[PDB]
Amino acid sequence: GLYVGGFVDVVSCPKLEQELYLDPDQVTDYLPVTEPLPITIEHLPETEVGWTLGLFQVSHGIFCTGAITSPAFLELASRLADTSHVARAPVKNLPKEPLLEILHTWLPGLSLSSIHPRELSQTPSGPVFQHVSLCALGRRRGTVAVYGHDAEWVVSRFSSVSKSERAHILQHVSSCRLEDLSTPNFVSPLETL
Numbered sequence: 431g432l433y434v435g436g437f438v439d440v441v442s443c444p445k446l447e448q449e450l451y452l453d454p455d456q457v458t459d460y461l462p463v464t465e466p467l468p469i470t471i472e473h474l475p476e477t478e479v480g481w482t483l484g485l486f487q488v489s490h491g492i493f494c495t496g497a498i499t500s501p502a503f504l505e506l507a508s509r510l511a512d513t514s515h516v517a518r519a520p521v522k523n524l525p526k527e528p529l530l531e532i533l534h535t536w537l538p539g540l541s542l543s544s545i546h547p548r549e550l551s552q553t554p555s556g557p558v559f560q561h562v563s564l565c566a567l568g569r570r571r572g573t574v575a576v577y578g579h580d581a582e583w584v585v586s587r588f589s590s591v592s593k594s595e596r597a598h599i600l601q602h603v604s605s606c607r608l609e610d611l612s613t614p615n616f617v618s619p620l621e622t623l
């Protein structure tokens with residue numbers, strides 16, 4: 431069970447013909463998001479690995495904290511981190527905690543999916559946000575995502591998050607028992623072979 435944290439990029443209609451990144455202010459009226467959104471990979475169906483634990487406007491942007499909870503994904507990633515020369519190639523040699531490093535390097539981007547801003551300027555009918563994705567490519571305003579085993583340690587790593595803002599981010603992790611989150615739908619794309 432891991433935590434992830436970072437500032438996000440806001441993307442409308444991701445990876446499709448109409449993809450467009452949004453100014454955070456285009457969606458800050460719809461923050462904070464206190465209810466769990468799925469965390470997926472590269473905006474792909476059926477790659478749920480976790481659930482968000484809060485999305486907040488802070489001084490420097492929109493900060494996301496999440497929980498990576500998928501047993502299939504954690505087991506696969508961790509096995510890769512211990513035995514795959516390919517996974518480890520772009521990481522510093524001999525890391526302590528290779529799983530954290532592997533994730534930090536291969537999935538540095540947090541991408542928050544939203545409806546098109548033509549809906550957001552007016553009054554939206556339904557949910558403004560759909561999910562947060564861990565992304566290999568496309569990070570812009572977002573920071574490099576931090577992965578760790580305890581939520582306070584993760585939020586602690588960003589210097590552009592104040593002690594009060596951090597004290598406005600840890601209440602909500604500790605407000606949701608990880609055990610009570612739904613089981614995410616990630617399946618290893620290995621034994622599909």
Ligand SMILES: O=C(O)c1ccc(NC(=O)c2cccc(CC3CCCCC3)n2)c(Nc2cccc(OC(F)(F)F)c2)c1
Nearest residue numbers: 471474477503506507510517532533536537566618619620
């Ligand atoms: O169908 C195939 O054969 C198939 C082949 C390759 C795939 N991935 C990449 O090319 C790729 C590229 C960059 C980053 C990542 C995330 C990994 C990075 C290493 C350590 C954990 C997570 N994946 C995927 N797609 C994929 C979907 C989600 C997670 C994923 O990684 C893992 F399976 F390890 F969970 C792979 C599928």
Ligand SMILES: O=C(O)c1ccc(NC(=O)c2cccc(CC3CCCCC3)n2)c(Nc2cccc(OC(F)(F)F)c2)c1
Nearest residue numbers: 506507509510511513514515516517518536618619620623
């Ligand atoms: O069984 C083993 O010991 C085994 C161990 C490690 C493997 N790969 C990685 O560490 C790795 C890491 C990052 C990207 C990729 C994709 C590359 C390489 C695979 C073919 C697509 C191009 N692979 C795989 N190969 C593999 C197949 C399909 C998906 C996959 O997951 C993922 F790409 F996400 F790592 C890994 C197998």
